[PDB]
Design an enzyme around this catalytic site. Structure first.
Site, PDB file in Angstrom:
ATOM      1  N   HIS A  16       0.784  -1.176   0.022  1.00  0.00           N
ATOM      2  CA  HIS A  16      -0.153   0.050  -0.033  1.00  0.00           C
ATOM      3  C   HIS A  16       0.825   1.226  -0.221  1.00  0.00           C
ATOM      4  CE1 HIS A  16      -3.141  -2.902   1.391  1.00  0.00           C
ATOM      5  NE2 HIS A  16      -3.765  -2.228   0.374  1.00  0.00           N
ATOM      6  N   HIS A  43       1.337   1.340  -5.650  1.00  0.00           N
ATOM      7  CA  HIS A  43      -0.028   1.104  -5.782  1.00  0.00           C
ATOM      8  C   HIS A  43      -0.804   2.092  -6.326  1.00  0.00           C
ATOM      9  CE1 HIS A  43      -3.512  -1.045  -4.843  1.00  0.00           C
ATOM     10  NE2 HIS A  43      -3.916  -0.248  -3.839  1.00  0.00           N
ATOM     11  N   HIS A  79      -6.196   7.216  -2.982  1.00  0.00           N
ATOM     12  CA  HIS A  79      -7.117   6.559  -2.426  1.00  0.00           C
ATOM     13  C   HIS A  79      -6.421   5.652  -1.325  1.00  0.00           C
ATOM     14  CE1 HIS A  79      -5.320   2.992  -4.503  1.00  0.00           C
ATOM     15  NE2 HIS A  79      -6.211   2.167  -3.567  1.00  0.00           N
ATOM     16  N   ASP A  80      -5.280   5.671  -1.203  1.00  0.00           N
ATOM     17  CA  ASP A  80      -4.779   4.755   0.044  1.00  0.00           C
ATOM     18  C   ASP A  80      -3.826   5.715   0.621  1.00  0.00           C
ATOM     19  OD1 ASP A  80      -5.779   2.309   0.393  1.00  0.00           O
ATOM     20  OD2 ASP A  80      -4.717   1.481  -1.365  1.00  0.00           O
ATOM     21  N   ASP A 131      -8.453  -0.904  -8.189  1.00  0.00           N
ATOM     22  CA  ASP A 131      -7.772  -1.610  -6.795  1.00  0.00           C
ATOM     23  C   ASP A 131      -7.541  -2.984  -6.694  1.00  0.00           C
ATOM     24  OD1 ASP A 131      -6.816  -0.830  -4.266  1.00  0.00           O
ATOM     25  OD2 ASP A 131      -8.718  -1.029  -3.219  1.00  0.00           O
ATOM     26  N   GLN A 142      -6.025 -17.880  -2.784  1.00  0.00           N
ATOM     27  CA  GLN A 142      -6.210 -16.602  -4.121  1.00  0.00           C
ATOM     28  C   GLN A 142      -7.287 -17.120  -4.876  1.00  0.00           C
ATOM     29  OE1 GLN A 142      -4.344 -14.188  -5.325  1.00  0.00           O
ATOM     30  NE2 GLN A 142      -4.511 -13.796  -3.166  1.00  0.00           N
TER      31      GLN A 142
HETATM   32  C1  KIS Z   1      -2.244  -8.365  -4.529  1.00  0.00           C
HETATM   33  C2  KIS Z   1      -3.332  -9.422  -4.656  1.00  0.00           C
HETATM   34  O1  KIS Z   1      -4.370  -8.896  -3.893  1.00  0.00           O
HETATM   35  C3  KIS Z   1      -4.950  -9.894  -3.125  1.00  0.00           C
HETATM   36  O2  KIS Z   1      -4.220 -10.856  -2.878  1.00  0.00           O
HETATM   37  C4  KIS Z   1      -5.726  -9.376  -2.111  1.00  0.00           C
HETATM   38  N1  KIS Z   1      -6.600  -8.172  -2.197  1.00  0.00           N
HETATM   39  C5  KIS Z   1      -7.498  -8.072  -1.548  1.00  0.00           C
HETATM   40  N2  KIS Z   1      -7.450  -9.363  -0.881  1.00  0.00           N
HETATM   41  C6  KIS Z   1      -8.674  -9.487   0.128  1.00  0.00           C
HETATM   42  C7  KIS Z   1      -8.727  -8.676   1.138  1.00  0.00           C
HETATM   43  C8  KIS Z   1      -9.691  -8.949   2.167  1.00  0.00           C
HETATM   44  C9  KIS Z   1     -10.828 -10.220   2.095  1.00  0.00           C
HETATM   45  C10 KIS Z   1     -10.292 -11.063   0.688  1.00  0.00           C
HETATM   46  O3  KIS Z   1     -11.266 -12.115   0.692  1.00  0.00           O
HETATM   47  C11 KIS Z   1     -11.299 -13.422   0.457  1.00  0.00           C
HETATM   48  C12 KIS Z   1     -12.151 -14.082  -0.223  1.00  0.00           C
HETATM   49  C13 KIS Z   1     -11.809 -15.618  -0.165  1.00  0.00           C
HETATM   50  C14 KIS Z   1     -10.536 -16.091   0.263  1.00  0.00           C
HETATM   51  C15 KIS Z   1      -9.584 -14.994   0.725  1.00  0.00           C
HETATM   52  N3  KIS Z   1      -8.392 -15.589   1.017  1.00  0.00           N
HETATM   53  C16 KIS Z   1      -7.031 -15.031   0.386  1.00  0.00           C
HETATM   54  N4  KIS Z   1      -5.926 -15.804   1.053  1.00  0.00           N
HETATM   55  C17 KIS Z   1      -6.671 -16.298   1.936  1.00  0.00           C
HETATM   56  C18 KIS Z   1      -5.902 -17.401   2.845  1.00  0.00           C
HETATM   57  O4  KIS Z   1      -6.220 -17.993   3.915  1.00  0.00           O
HETATM   58  O5  KIS Z   1      -4.476 -17.406   2.415  1.00  0.00           O
HETATM   59  C19 KIS Z   1      -3.750 -17.985   3.504  1.00  0.00           C
HETATM   60  C20 KIS Z   1      -2.400 -17.491   3.830  1.00  0.00           C
HETATM   61  C21 KIS Z   1      -7.877 -16.395   2.027  1.00  0.00           C
HETATM   62  C22 KIS Z   1      -8.779 -17.270   2.880  1.00  0.00           C
HETATM   63  C23 KIS Z   1      -9.958 -13.854   0.840  1.00  0.00           C
HETATM   64  C24 KIS Z   1      -9.312 -10.676  -0.070  1.00  0.00           C
HETATM   65  C25 KIS Z   1      -6.601 -10.211  -1.300  1.00  0.00           C
HETATM   66  C26 KIS Z   1      -6.078 -11.462  -0.934  1.00  0.00           C
HETATM   67 MG    MG Z   2      -7.333   0.821   0.727  1.00  0.00          MG
HETATM   68 ZN    ZN Z   3      -5.790   0.381  -2.700  1.00  0.00          ZN
END
Ligand code: KIS
Ligand code: MG
Ligand code: ZN
EC number: 3.1.4.17
Length: 312
Positions: free
Chosen positions: A67, A71, A105-106, A216, A268
């Site tokens: 962030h 970004h 935005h961040d 984003d 992911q």
């Molecule tokens: C640069 C790439 O951007 C990302 O990667 C990104 N950007 C925002 N979010 C995010 C923020 C809040 C909730 C969310 O929403 C989700 C939805 C469904 C699954 C997940 N999820 C992702 N990793 C795990 C995990 O456990 O990894 C284990 C280390 C889990 C559960 C996150 C996702 C991610 C993961």
């Molecule tokens: Mg933000």
């Molecule tokens: Zn952002």
């Protein structure tokens, strides 16, 4: 008569959704100016004030792994791509506001979630009960606009000024991904029932909110080596937050637990299926020329599936 220009490979590739802004930090401000000039015109901002604004914005991003200033400029470039592929759908005030909203935005992000601020009991969590960092980011935007010689919106009427600061506020608040889910559900239903009406300001607001989530999340729409290396940066933040949650005596969610590295590929998948794919799906429905963001995201989902199969 001073048109900003980029070397040929950038001049061409910058128009594409998957453009990476590169590792030369000192070119990012010129890339952004190039985009405002092409998206908005050489006339929309006084160059000396815009330059001063960009540089104060840069100074107010922190040296966190994800962030950060890169970004900010990456999210502005995706917005630029959407704007240039949907020329005639956006007002003059929207084009001016939205690239600025993306850059800002961040602002002054510390690399922690709204959740962690709330559990830590950070002062910002008392001032702003919901969308904590995102109200902070707007607040920082307004503070930088009010610095001497930083008001890029000086030329606008009292009316236009209130309108642009309100487009920016809503744009920035929409980047709170807790708000994304309801916004996209509503936009999906409106699109399918045919109630969607770009003349209804409330509808425009929702559509700009979805564009903000799309920009984003745009790391998922890049060439696989950009996507994979950016994922390493965002988890570096997420795991430092998990470390801090453990220091407060709280077991973090798996996404923030560095002991659950092993599970990143599958997380992911969840993220691509629950957030990214649906986001660009609804966006492509509402703005057909954004389709390359959906197709790239799908391609990157399929790279994460390959990681899981041990095919990489
Ligand atoms: C640069 C790439 O951007 C990302 O990667 C990104 N950007 C925002 N979010 C995010 C923020 C809040 C909730 C969310 O929403 C989700 C939805 C469904 C699954 C997940 N999820 C992702 N990793 C795990 C995990 O456990 O990894 C284990 C280390 C889990 C559960 C996150 C996702 C991610 C993961
Ligand atoms: Mg933000
Ligand atoms: Zn952002």
């Amino acid at each position: 008569l001073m048109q900003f220009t980029l070397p040929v490979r950038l001049c061409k590739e910058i128009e594409l959704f998957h453009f990476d802004i590169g590792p030369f930090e000192n070119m990012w401000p010129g890339i952004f100016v190039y985009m405002v000039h092409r998206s908005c015109g050489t006339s929309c901002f006084e160059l000396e004030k815009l330059c001063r604004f960009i540089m104060s914005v840069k100074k107010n991003y922190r040296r966190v792994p994800y962030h950060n200033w890169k970004h900010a400029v990456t999210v502005a470039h995706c917005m630029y791509a959407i704007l240039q592929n949907n020329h005639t759908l956006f007002t003059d005030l929207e084009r001016k506001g939205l690239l600025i909203a993306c850059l800002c935005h961040d602002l002054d992000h510390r690399g922690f979630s709204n959740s962690y601020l709330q559990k830590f009991d950070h002062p910002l969590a008392a001032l702003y009960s919901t969308s904590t960092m995102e109200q902070h980011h707007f607040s920082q935007t307004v503070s930088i606009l009010q610095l001497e010689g930083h008001n890029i919106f000086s030329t606008l009427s009292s009316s236009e000024y209130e309108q642009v600061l309100e487009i920016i506020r809503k744009a920035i608040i929409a980047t709170d991904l807790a708000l994304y889910f309801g916004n996209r559900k509503q936009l999906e239903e409106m699109y399918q029932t045919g109630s969607l009406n770009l003349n209804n300001q409330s509808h425009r607001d929702r559509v700009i909110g979805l564009m903000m989530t799309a920009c984003d999340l745009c790391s998922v729409t890049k060439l696989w080596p950009v996507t994979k290396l950016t994922a390493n940066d965002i988890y570096a933040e997420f795991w430092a937050e998990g470390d801090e949650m453990k220091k407060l005596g709280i077991q973090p969610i798996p996404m923030m637990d560095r002991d659950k590295k092993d599970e990143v590929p599958q997380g992911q998948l969840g993220f691509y299926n629950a957030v990214a794919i649906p986001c660009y799906t609804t966006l492509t429905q509402i703005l057909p020329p954004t389709e390359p963001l959906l197709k790239a995201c799908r391609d990157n989902l399929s790279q994460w599936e390959k990681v899981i199969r041990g095919e990489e």
